[PDB]
């Protein structure tokens, strides 16, 4: 808890630090047994009212809950794991150089058109589930069974309806297009995201193992892991793949996380 607790001194000693390392795989819609990492073909509704996208066409937020070494044995004068640093990168960036498989020729006898278009790259590290706010491009969209979407949507949901509050608490369920991190909450999470729109924009993906992000806030306090659990969330929609017919599919990639944590004492 960043606010419901008194945040005291950091513990030192050999056993006072730990490390989490993992991959979050993308959830682009996975329309059949061969298309992990891709969405279904994008289909365009004839009016706002008749928008009824298939579940397999909607990328979702990825989330992992990582159990940490058990501390204490409750509440009160207690120790919590605090996330201090993050290393992260997209995994498989060179796979986008496959311009020879099932593609559309750029011109006669040319190479295939590569993955391009709208991208969303997003990652978060928190001591509890990412807190979400719903915002709809079109409030009359019918979101499909099996997704968790903003309910009782009104025309105000197209700009800001404070009723649409949720926790990123399930995989393959929260569509990227209906939810964003809630800037009024998330005191115990650090989140970072970039949306690059446009149907021709090229992916620009950097990799290195030399870059670290510090997760401490203004007061030197990182995310504090309630119940000894670390929450990682990601979206890496790289753009769209185009088949020869012109049908287009979202293509996503996995994200790596390495988080360093230390023990910190808190009260209440």
């Amino acid at each position, epitope marked *: 808890h960043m606010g419901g607790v008194e945040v005291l001194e950091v513990k030192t000693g050999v056993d006072s630090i730990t490390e989490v390392e993992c991959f979050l795989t993308p959830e682009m819609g996975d*329309p059949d047994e061969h298309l992990r990492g891709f969405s279904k073909s994008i*289909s365009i509704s004839d009016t706002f009212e*008749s928008d*009824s996208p298939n579940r397999d066409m909607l990328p979702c937020y990825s989330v992992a809950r990582i159990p940490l070494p058990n501390l204490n044995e409750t509440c009160g004068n207690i120790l919590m794991w605090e996330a201090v640093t993050l290393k992260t990168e997209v995994i498989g960036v060179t796979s986008l150089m496959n311009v020879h498989s099932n593609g559309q020729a750029t011109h006669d006898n040319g190479a295939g058109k590569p993955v391009q278009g709208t991208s969303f790259h997003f990652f978060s590290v928190g001591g509890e589930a990412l807190e979400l706010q719903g915002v709809l491009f079109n409030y009359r969209t019918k979101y499909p069974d099996g997704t968790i979407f903003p309910k009782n949507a009104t025309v105000q949901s197209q700009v800001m309806n404070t009723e649409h509050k949720a926790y990123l608490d399930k995989n393959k369920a929260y569509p990227v297009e209906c939810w964003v991190p809630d800037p009024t909450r998330n005191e115990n999470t650090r989140y970072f995201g970039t949306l690059t729109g446009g149907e021709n924009v090229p992916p620009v993906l950097h990799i290195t193992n030399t870059a670290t992000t510090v997760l401490l806030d203004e007061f030197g306090v990182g995310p504090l892991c309630k119940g000894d659990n670390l929450y990682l969330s990601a979206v890496d929609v790289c753009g769209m793949f185009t088949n020869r017919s012109g049908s287009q599919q979202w293509r996503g990639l996995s994200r790596y996380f390495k988080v360093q944590l230390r023990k910190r004492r808190v009260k209440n």
Partner: single-chain antibody
Amino acid sequence: MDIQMTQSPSSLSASVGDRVTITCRASQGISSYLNWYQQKPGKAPKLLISATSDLQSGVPSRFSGSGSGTDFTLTISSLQPEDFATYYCQQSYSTPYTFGQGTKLEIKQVQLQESGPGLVKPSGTLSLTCAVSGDSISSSNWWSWVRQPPGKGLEWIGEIYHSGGTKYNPSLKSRVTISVDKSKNHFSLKLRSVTAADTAVYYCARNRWFDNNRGGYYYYGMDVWGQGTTVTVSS
């Protein structure tokens, strides 16, 4: 977009076992957004093929379709006595949806029910209801009205969505209202200022889209029709 569909030949005489090919041409490119319907005498049209070549379930596999852009073909591999009917193409690329004039072939579950007054005075208001059973009005599809004047092809009037949005044929927009009532699971048609040109068989139909994975604009076809109700304008 105004897209005129022309069908060829207008009539065809063939014998059981013949190979039969009907063609249609669009006045501008419609990509693969082309449907085929079969209308047996005195019955509602029946959807055979969606999206140039996707056969409806229950349709005999002797029917096939092909084509691109502006030119399309419906083929019967081996003609059989079942198949005497008038065949219509229909572009689904752009509203107003438009049908070909029809090819008459002579050989040598959701339910919709239309109801309303059989007679209307000239300048009066035609009013009909389409009762929907075995499916909710709240489904993800349009609810359409189509009419067929005496021996004279098919005309799309308009459609309504369960949330109340409508699409109307621009030739009728000034005088037509379509409404929906989810509590009664029906939808309705009003046509004002009728003249003798409005004498016709009126059909209601489900205009739903097909998950065919082609991508792009939704592919629509009218896969369930009511039985049709005649309305005559008479003083």
